[PDB]
Amino acid sequence: TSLTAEEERFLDAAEYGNIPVVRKMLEESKTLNVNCVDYMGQNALQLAVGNEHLEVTELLLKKENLARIGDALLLAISKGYVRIVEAILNHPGFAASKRLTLSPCEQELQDDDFYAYDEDGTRFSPDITPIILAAHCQKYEVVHMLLMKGARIERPHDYFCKCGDCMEKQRHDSFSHSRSRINAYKGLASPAYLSLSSEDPVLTALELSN
Amino acid sequence: ELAKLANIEKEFKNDYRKLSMQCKDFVVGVLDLCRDSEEVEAILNGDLEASLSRVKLAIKYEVKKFVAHPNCQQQLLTIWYENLSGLREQTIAIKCLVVLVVAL
């Protein structure tokens, strides 16, 4: 119980969806950090997206510094929400980079808490990008939004390509590499991706089955 | 313990055998969730501070689905070919050439 009383009066009003009680505390602008830890270690956006509160989510993104907009994005694609995903992709700091394309582990040196959940590890496997997670859950509206933004799954290499990048990821942790290949093919082999990604889809389905 | 009480009671035979399945499925459901190689090499042998101790203890108790799971089979396969490593995916003709050369 490290949190103060303003922290609780902020967190409970966020998790219940009180638009005036949260609007007043952001408008007060006195002695408030947008980052916080409650129970397991909930955020503002993690609490506000876990139950669908769009009016709160339009307000929390008004401030500049939120450190966990990647796990709100994965939690929103994991659920059915679409307009919340449009709000998160409408954010300017998320959009003007190669954040859609990069895996959280391969995203950078990755010391930032961008894809971080709680403290121990990322919500899902560190290889899963958002367009793969959309194709696993078969959400036809989210895949179209992410394909218009410009994210396309990259085909994994051949079993023995022997390229420098493949060997370096093979000499260290063979198991996670072999798991990431199956996650990529589970992303590619789905009716969501197959129908909306390329023209002439019946031929690429017959070819990918081979 | 449950699988040995099942052979001593013999009237409550089905109940202890129903409980042993829960005791095995807990271990298999824990095994599923591991992602990195450090978690697999932390489950398959215990705290060190090879030597496959939990696998050698799951042979004695006959937990078949803990050994027949793929996350254990790949760790055993990377020991079964631990210096050859190119023979891991070859035809049966190349394997028969090997046993003929060694038998000669």
Measured between alpha carbons, how far is A148 from B53 in angstroms, rounded to an integer? 52
For B28, other C-beta atoms within 10 Å of its C-beta total 14
First CA to last CA distance, chain A:
56
Q: Buried b vs exposed e over A114-124: b needs ≥16 C-beta within 10 Å?
A: bbbbeeeebbb
Using the structure block, give the residue that is written with the tokens 């994994």.
A156
Q: Residue B103 carries which side chain, given as an amino acid letter?
A: A
3-class secondary structure for A78-139?
HCCCCHHHHHHHCCHHHHCCCCCCCCCCCCCCCCCCCCCCCCCCCCCCCCCCHHHHHHHHCC
Q: Residue A29 carries which side chain, given as an amino acid letter?
A: S
Quick one: resolution in A? 3.3
For A96, other C-beta atoms within 10 Å of its C-beta total 8
Contact between A127 and A136 under an 8 Å Cβ cutoff? The reply is no
Q: State the nearest Cα–Cα gap between B64 and chain A, in angstroms.
A: 22
Does A176 contact B78 at a Cβ distance shorter than 8 Å? no
Q: After which residues does chain A break, using C–N > 2.5 Å?
A: none
Q: Residue A191 carries which side chain, given as an amino acid letter?
A: P
Does B37 contact A174 at a Cβ distance shorter than 8 Å? yes
Using the structure block, give the residue that is written with the tokens 């009066």.
A9
Nearest by Cα to A67 from A32, A31, A118, A103: A118
**Experimental method reported for this structure:** cryo-EM
Measured between alpha carbons, how far is B64 from A155 in angstroms, rounded to an integer? 36
How many residue pairs bridge chain A and chain B with CB atoms within 8 Å of each other? 19
Instruction: Give the nearest chain B residue to A122 (CA atoms).
Output: B35
Tokens of A55: 């009016």
